[PDB]
């Protein structure tokens, strides 16, 4: 009855204030490489941490000392923590993520617009808007009437909508010509074939 697991926050011994506990797990090349980092933050200051590549608790600042000492003293805490790497990170990735986030596919929607706003003394910017896609993996190319435009391509940073979708703006530098067709070519894992869009007139 319980699929997705959460990393447990260790309790210590003995105006506006805040504390944050962060359990983070990084994966690379599947589940082949899994590292577990947990942090204890007071206000905005991390004081104690548990790093996979380290093997135990370490204070990152002077006030994290009492906890590093104690929790490393307590074999249980140390063992619960040290093992979360399989029970939580490997577990979640295998189970949850692989049937949830790792399978999410959002097909991008491309549109082309004439930019840098007016008509031709320096007016070149074709903006292609690729929006509402997932994951963040993507390749956009520009084509000027048959061939690809390498020089004069400017991509804006990847924007994260927050609703599990991205968007980005890829521009092409120019000075148009009648008889010319500019194409926006997008390559993404959600598509079955790269998608296209074209501007003229």
């Amino acid at each position: 009855g319980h699929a997705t697991q959460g990393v447990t926050a260790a309790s210590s011994h003995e105006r506006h204030f805040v504390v944050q506990f962060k359990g983070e797990c990084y994966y690379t090349n599947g589940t082949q490489r899994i590292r577990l980092v947990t942090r204890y933050i007071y206000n905005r200051e991390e004081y104690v941490r548990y790093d996979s590549d380290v093997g135990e608790y370490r204070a990152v600042t002077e006030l994290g000392r009492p906890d590093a000492e104690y929790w490393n003293s307590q074999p249980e805490i140390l063992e619960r923590t040290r093992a979360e790497v399989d029970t939580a990170c490997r577990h979640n990735y295998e189970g949850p993520e692989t049937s949830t986030s790792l399978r999410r596919l959002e097909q991008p929607n491309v549109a082309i617009s004439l930019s840098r706003t007016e008509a031709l003394n320096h007016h070149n910017t074709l903006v292609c808007s690729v929006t509402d896609f997932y994951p963040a993996k993507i390749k956009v190319r520009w084509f000027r009437n048959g061939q690809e435009e390498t020089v004069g391509v400017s991509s804006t940073q990847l924007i994260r909508n927050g609703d599990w979708t991205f968007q980005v703006l890829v521009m092409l530098e120019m000075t148009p010509h009648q008889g010319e067709v500019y194409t926006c070519h997008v390559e993404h894992p959600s598509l079955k074939s790269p998608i296209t869009v074209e501007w003229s007139s």
Partner: protein, 187 residues
């Protein structure tokens, strides 16, 4: 570090005055769910996800209890050093290309939030619009500050002006981030 994916699996937050606490999970920078510490229900960002997997709320509550305890201990160990109010940064942008008359969503990304206490609201033609409005949880930042997203559904129109009201303690006066279909430089 170098990673192909990163899951935030146990993230807890607790603030003393008011006994304010939060519990969430993220995967690759996106919010998975949060636990209604009031209803005691695991609420999913993508409701299709909780349909295929499930999180037991007691796991979160248990973590809230840990941080609540630790909060007390750390406060004293610090000699009662309080949090320092930072000034948030907001940016308004549309989910898709704004096309006059075509249904869309306005997005307000507020960053550098600390402490994790804030008021994000929307105004159309200068009056509050409580209208298909949604708001993310406090999403975690690497520098231990938070960021948040607010949404407003709307159908593009040149005759309306939108503001995202952001109020914070690190805030002197409400910040009003503008947006208009006609490019409306401040109103």
């Amino acid at each position: 570090i170098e990673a192909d994916h990163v899951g935030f699996y146990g993230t807890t937050v607790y603030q003393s005055p008011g006994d304010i606490g939060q519990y969430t999970h993220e995967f690759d920078g996106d919010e998975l769910f949060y636990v209604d510490l009031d209803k005691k229900k695991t609420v999913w960002r993508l409701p299709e996800f909780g349909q295929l997997i499930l999180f037991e709320p007691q796991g979160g509550l248990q973590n809230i209890a840990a941080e609540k305890h630790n909060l007390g201990i750390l406060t004293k160990r610090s000699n009662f050093t309080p949090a320092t109010n930072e000034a948030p940064q907001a940016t308004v942008f549309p989910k898709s290309p704004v096309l006059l008359g075509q249904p869309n969503t306005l997005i307000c990304f507020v960053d550098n939030i600390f402490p994790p206490v804030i008021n994000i609201t929307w105004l159309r033609n200068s009056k509050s619009v409580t209208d298909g409005v949604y708001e993310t949880s406090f999403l975690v930042n690497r520098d231990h500050s938070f960021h948040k997203l607010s949404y407003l559904t709307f159908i593009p129109s040149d005759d309306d002006i939108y503001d995202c009201k952001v109020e914070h303690w690190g805030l002197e006066e409400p910040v009003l981030k503008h947006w208009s279909s006609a490019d409306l430089v401040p109103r």
